[PDB]
Amino acid sequence: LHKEPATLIKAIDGDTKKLMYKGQPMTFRELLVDTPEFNEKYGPEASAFTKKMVENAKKIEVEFDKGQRTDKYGRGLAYIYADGKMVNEALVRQGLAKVAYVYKGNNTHEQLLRKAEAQAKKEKLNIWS
Numbered sequence: 206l207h208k209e210p211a212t213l214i215k216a217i218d219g220d221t222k223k224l225m226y227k228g229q230p231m232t233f234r235e236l237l238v239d240t241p242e243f244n245e246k247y248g249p250e251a252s253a254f255t256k257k258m259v260e261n262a263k264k265i266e267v268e269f270d271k272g273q274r275t276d277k278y279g280r281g282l283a284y285i286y287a288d289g290k291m292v293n294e295a296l297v298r299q300g301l302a303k304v305a306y307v308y309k310g311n312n313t314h315e316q317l318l319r320k321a322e323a324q325a326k327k328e329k330l331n332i333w334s
């Protein structure tokens with residue numbers, strides 16, 4: 206896998222955001238995670254977490270996996286990095302997302318995120334409290 210440039214257009218919620226990629230606006234959906242919706246428990250905190258992480262970043266990068274790059278809704282499916290730090294992983298590590306939607310062909314960072322979830326679950330953080 207490799208990292209590609211992108212710029213933040215706008216935070217949306219825990220696991221989606223509007224980025225400019227190859228000069229075009231797209232909604233990105235984070236691979237391998239599920240944040241609660243804004244109206245659910247920990248939803249506002251997920252959105253806040255993701256929003257801060259991507260808004261404070263100097264450099265946003267996207268990393269596609271080996272499989273499908275866009276979902277049925279036209280959302281790009283990628284791993285998102287903010288100053289080299291994976292948003293998908295940080296959400297999981299803090300208990301603000303669950304590992305989810307693990308499809309074959311698009312699961313390179315699965316075990317990395319599962320390790321992060323275990324740690325969150327041990328620490329009883331947020332969703333696991």
Ligand SMILES: Cc1cn([C@H]2C[C@H](OP(=O)(O)O)[C@@H](COP(=O)(O)O)O2)c(=O)[nH]c1=O
Pocket residue numbers: 234235236237238239276277282306308311
């Ligand atoms: C994360 C991800 C979601 N999706 C689709 C499956 C789900 O379909 P349904 O809309 O039919 O439930 C939906 C979940 O996204 P959200 O969690 O953003 O709603 O997005 C994929 O197709 N591939 C993926 O990698």
Ligand SMILES: [Ca+2]
Pocket residue numbers: 220239240241242
């Ligand atoms: Ca969600």
